[PDB]
Design a protein around this ligand. Structure first.
Ligand code: M2P
Ligand code: M2P
Ligand code: M2P
Ligand code: M2P
Lengths: 363, 363, 363, 363
């Protein structure tokens, strides 16, 4: 009979197998995909000129940390330039990543662009020629990709248009990726900017994710062959009201349970500005939340895995080891965190629970 | 938007507790909500006059079955008439149901109506004065409701309009119910009529459910305070190709995992014309399907729980006891099935977890 | 995704012929469809008891005005009760209306109901059994109907949900009407309540009408067989900034030109609280607006045609003539207005300039 | 309350003024924007090598036709390459166009791309860096742009996804253009391929356009600053039923009246494979259609203005004069057609004194 499925069972198996590898138990993602202009600001914060060699050295610094990170890193997201650079031993970075047990990912969006008629809202571009790009990236060692849409909570934002448009472009991106054997990481980041409280973020997150999945369905996206990279549900950066990690965890898990189909292979949280410690603690609380979570809940951190490393390096080659040690430190912390076994202190623990605390209908 | 939550933490807790009671481990729902017109067909099928007394006697037959059904029945759906009838001992049927540990339910839709401009498609009516009806039903013993929408698989159905409209009306229905302390069972039934295959039914079910949940989100429905009543995923009635129960189970569970948020408290399958044994076996296979299932997967059967009871009764007072044994038998069978413990032996349960080496990428 | 003719060519002609008849040059609509509870309030503003006879007498007063109203009134909307009432001469009100060359219309909605999760927003009920009601109304003399949805401008309103839902139910209402030979007047009223300015009302009116027509399209509605009853575009009742009639006319015609397809037979403005004189003057400025207007632009007034009459009557039968004279005054004025030939009289100003605005909140 | 206007009054004025200039009475558009690959097909049909010089000479040939085309061409669409080429006299082609009273247009889409999971349907790419491209084009002489989406009528096409996606990307393209002072020509072309009949094409065209305008509204598009470039409503190429030009005209105008807001400045039909004569005769019948049309109905022809000229040229510079004469004849023909004054094989006549309103409802 008449039938035109988007993928064959062979294409589905390849995508599903890749997605599961990335978020296998205890593993997370290192998001080191900052574009030229963005990494330039990072290097600037430590008085380091933004040359290709310094970008190569910094990326090599993270990608070649010792084997203690192997069990912690299921994947590494790179920016185009880096995907084609090499370590001092002549090995292309994709080979270095793979030799350490990681799956190579490539950021494919081309930045945000303003949505006319909105209060400073944006959508994301990068769809032009994406299919050919994906085909080339695949041949060059990449198995997954990343695309970032940005939404903001404000007076009249996110608006209906911004929500619908961003969800739609994510679906287009995901569709093209899957046609090329690349697992798409869908990143609809809701910024923490503003003074909104926890319930407001949870509400917006629920509305945004519902839109994202309806769009993924309309575009015939194979969910088992994807990963979701959302913001955790937290109060606004300037929210006067304060909250505990357990509340943040409850709000986040609740929002996800109400919008993310169990078919989605994994949820890899962005750190969104949270300190390295805060990001690890919250991820740990999320994994210890009493609710049933049918998908891996791990990390895809940029700042939360590089903050201390960048600083320790200071743009000086003699600080290589010390810098790598800071990164390992966070890779190890978050690996435990995505399993709910993180105790902020040293590395050893004992107990891990929070009995006598129910009633979560306040969410 | 983002103005005034639909439910307080108190209302949420009430709706959630009710929903969970209905689908507690080993429990399912008896769907005896046939309207006067539909019950006439059943009675006529056994040479029995369609009088209010015969309807009462029949419903009494099912509701007063012995204590063996107590742990099997978490809820009972009734038609308006029956909610206000009494057993021979003078006890209102709702009291009879509650005394056996069941939650009382009430059907609130007013039948299907044709959608102009479509190929024989419909939407369902019954929203007028629904809030008032719900407040009254709640007061009179009902804690949940049921609303049925009907869709068909055909050359050009379900159409975009049918999918959209039915999803929207279901959302309106659920919203009104939740404002009145009533748990809404959302029933988007896709008829098994036609010669379409299993893959086609899975496809359509996936599209329908994605639409159903997007609408529930748009209407601010509290998912934890709802239940889903969908068709299992099966080939069309006239489909020549044959499938196994494992294939029906796999297709069904896959469809649900790709569309139903984990927040949904439970899925209560309609039997849709399957024989009593067929409905029990598929339900059992569904619960044995190796994939992760974040919600209760049980029954809300009408024909699958009454077929043999109705036949044995035959409208004859003398067959009351024989008729009840037939109903109890199915009640016990499905109770085991919703736990994946149904074997033709009965209480014994050694044969389980059969096979394992399989591929779900074919779905 | 093919075409399944909702209407035959014969049905289309009937609906189109009716629509054009109602808004023929120089003609408008008398909206006397206030329900028992709404009319009761009008009778209390004149110390008149709300009795069936008083409602009948009042309706007879308007409907039996001298022949001067014949060229002015293309149609009259009635409430259910009045449709089956008779004049002192024994003639059913529909026969009376028809003998004066007017088309009989029937209000069929059942009032607004609250949308949970919104900031005091509503949708409208009345679809249940609407097909049968329309069939009977048709046999009893009615050729068109009216259904009112209510939207409010404020902080966060109209919400995406309120706009979507109200547009969809209007579409359902219109579909059922056309299946029974009744022309549906689609009324998506955006209340004037608030301190918003002209451009804000224009903005919201454009978004609302865009939604209304997309919905009408999705439901396969025959536009030539419909009429639109919108609010004129004006500043909020509490706006400080003042505007001329030319500006109001410009904003109104512009919003309409940007959303209403030329196929729509006519636009019949509701007066929404404006005084009899203001409503006429604005309708006149609208028809004088230089921009191309592909549809008839006339009136369908309730308050703006009854203000002075209800007053002159005072429930005292002796004031029959005086009261009827005030009604004729406004019909003639509006008849000229919808032709762009009205210049104020300056005679009857006892209640023709009074603000007929009414607070809107709660039930 | 800000509404966040996408455009200021001056920006609107500029776009509106440009749109009206292109479709001024008696004027149409020459679509000579064939990309390198497409123009290759045209040149190969006449045994000519596809070199830049040959393309430059051919475009020069059209752009430099004598002054007789001046009153006929309100705008000329160019492909990027041609926008920066010069005539033999050293004048930039844009300068040539403007010196003859024409507005310069630029095609900005980057071709169609397959939509995964559909039956050979596509969407269009080209949004990446479009803002900067539009700013550059504006500075270099262009005042309007063109973007083509392609949909097809088939057993299951256009699908809901195809319609939704194409309408959305058209809205994004239109939004970016208007932000840069460029008038966007929205071209949602429904191919004539297939054996579907006239009513079928009319149905799909109505649905596609309704989707297009809802999307434009959602994206805050200033309609008075746009032009619509749709297919005329005709039977599929393989349709065995025959229709008159009057029938084609009725269906076309009817479809447009039911979906295109009067605010739209103009409708510029694509020829879509029709012969030069057919395209002219149909455009003429459309302009003579008795129904009310609130927008200019003219041409934006590619093949219908070049067929004979391309053939007469044959890649031989010695055929310049002959080639140009064929183009001049077609420009004159369509200029008359967009005024409803075209008569092939007998350019002579004088009538038109009545109007009336009769027609039928078979559309
Ligand atoms: O400025 P660019 O070139 O667009 O790069 C953006 C990129 O860094 C982000 O999308 C991160 O991959 C992701 O959001 C996690 O980052 P954190 O929020 O954990 O730091
Ligand atoms: O004809 P009516 O008055 O509308 O009643 C319909 C009602 O019986 C059904 O909705 C069942 O509750 C449900 O679909 C399970 O039925 P089964 O498919 O298991 O027989
Ligand atoms: O209170 P009910 O029973 O729902 O009746 C409502 C009805 O009067 C209105 O819908 C008018 O037909 C229309 O809005 C024009 O009224 P004006 O705005 O011209 O006064
Ligand atoms: O193949 P490309 O390089 O994408 O170019 C397409 C371009 O020729 C068309 O979009 C015309 O501007 C328009 O559709 C009218 O063409 P006709 O239908 O009148 O021939």
């Amino acid at each position: 009979p008449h039938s035109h499925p988007a993928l064959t069972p062979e294409q589905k198996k390849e995508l599903s197998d890749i997605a599961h590898r990335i978020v296998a138990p205890g593993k997370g993602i290192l998001a080191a995909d900052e574009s030229t202009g963005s990494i330039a600001k990072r290097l600037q914060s430590i008085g380091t000129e933004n040359t290709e060699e310094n970008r190569r050295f910094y990326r090599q610094l993270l990608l070649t940390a010792d084997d203690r990170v192997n069990p912690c890193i299921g994947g590494v997201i790179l920016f185009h330039e880096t995907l084609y650079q090499k370590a001092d031993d002549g090995r292309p970075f994709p080979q270095v990543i793979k030799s350490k047990g990681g799956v190579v990912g490539i950021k494919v969006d081309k930045g945000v662009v303003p949505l006319a008629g909105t209060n400073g809202e944006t959508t994301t571009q990068g769809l032009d020629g994406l299919s050919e790009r994906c085909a080339q990236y695949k041949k060059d060692g990449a198995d997954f990709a990343k695309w970032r849409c940005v939404l903001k909570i404000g007076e009249h934002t996110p608006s209906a248009l911004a929500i619908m448009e961003n969800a739609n472009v994510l679906a287009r991106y995901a569709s093209i990726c899957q046609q090329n054997g690349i697992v798409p990481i869908v990143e609809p980041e809701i910024l923490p900017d503003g003074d909104h409280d926890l319930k407001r973020c949870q509400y917006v997150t629920e509305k945004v994710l519902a839109a994202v999945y309806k769009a993924l369905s309309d575009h015939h996206i194979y969910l088992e062959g994807t990963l979701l990279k959302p913001n955790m549900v937290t109060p606004g950066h300037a929210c006067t009201q304060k909250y505990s990690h357990e509340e943040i965890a409850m709000a986040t898990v609740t929002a996800l349970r109400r919008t993310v189909p169990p078919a989605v292979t994994g949820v890899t949280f962005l750190s969104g500005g949270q300190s390295e410690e805060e990001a690890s603690i919250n991820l740990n609380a999320i994994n210890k939340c009493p609710l049933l979570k049918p998908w891996a809940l791990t990390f895809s951190y940029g700042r939360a895995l590089q903050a201390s490393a960048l600083k320790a390096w200071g743009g000086k080659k003699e600080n290589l080891k010390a810098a790598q040690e800071e990164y390992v430190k966070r890779a190890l912390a978050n690996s435990l965190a995505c399993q709910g076994k993180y105790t902020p202190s040293g590395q050893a623990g004992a107990a891990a629970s929070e009995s006598l605390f129910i009633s979560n209908h306040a969410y």
